[PDB]
Design an enzyme around this catalytic site. Structure first.
Site, mmCIF file in Angstrom:
data_model
loop_
_atom_site.group_PDB
_atom_site.id
_atom_site.type_symbol
_atom_site.label_atom_id
_atom_site.label_comp_id
_atom_site.label_asym_id
_atom_site.label_seq_id
_atom_site.Cartn_x
_atom_site.Cartn_y
_atom_site.Cartn_z
ATOM 1 N N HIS A 1 0.754 -1.243 -0.060
ATOM 2 C CA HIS A 1 -0.120 -0.038 -0.113
ATOM 3 C C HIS A 1 0.720 1.441 -0.112
ATOM 4 C CE1 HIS A 1 -1.939 -3.447 2.068
ATOM 5 N NE2 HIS A 1 -3.149 -3.065 1.302
HETATM 6 S S1 FES Z 1 1.851 -0.518 3.185
HETATM 7 FE FE1 FES Z 1 0.315 -1.989 3.673
HETATM 8 S S2 FES Z 1 1.310 -3.825 4.347
HETATM 9 FE FE2 FES Z 1 2.975 -2.285 3.959
#
Ligand code: FES
Length: 141
Positions: free
Chosen positions: A106
């Site tokens: 993410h």
């Molecule tokens: S940014 Fe979501 S698991 Fe690493």
């Protein structure tokens, strides 16, 4: 006992050794002089997470660069390679926008001391119980 013993005698500057402990990766990065200087160039007021997240020292310690490494010289950065958002494995070798690690799940970015600087992860990568037991070996646990 759970503790393991990692030979770091062959780890050169700019190399990360990854070793599995308690089912998850531990990153042992021998930081470059650039990595060290830049970590030391960040002010606490610039950090998303000012807590050191370091099992070896007081739990209220500040996330100064010095409180993120095993050694005073700052060469040995030992951390759980477990994104503090949802647990993906961060990608290193000076990745992301802050000269450290990037989690592609993410889009979280950590700096050269493993401190969170951007993205949804809430915390600096945590530091396991870890110490040198001689010149060449780090005990984890
Ligand atoms: S940014 Fe979501 S698991 Fe690493």
């Amino acid at each position: 006992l759970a503790s393991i013993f990692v030979d770091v005698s062959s780890v050169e500057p700019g190399v990360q050794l990854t070793v599995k402990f308690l089912g998850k990766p531990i990153f042992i990065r021998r930081r470059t002089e650039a990595d060290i200087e830049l970590g030391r160039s960040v002010q606490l007021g610039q950090l998303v997470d000012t807590n050191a997240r370091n099992a070896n020292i007081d739990a209220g310690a500040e996330a100064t660069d010095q409180n993120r490494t095993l050694d005073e010289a700052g060469e040995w950065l030992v951390m759980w390679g477990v994104c503090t958002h949802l647990g993906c494995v961060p990608i290193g070798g000076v990745s992301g926008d802050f000269g450290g690690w990037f989690c592609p799940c993410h889009g979280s970015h950590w700096d050269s001391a493993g401190r969170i600087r951007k993205g949804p992860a809430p915390e600096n990568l945590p530091i396991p119980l870890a110490k040198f037991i001689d010149e060449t070996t780090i005990q984890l646990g």
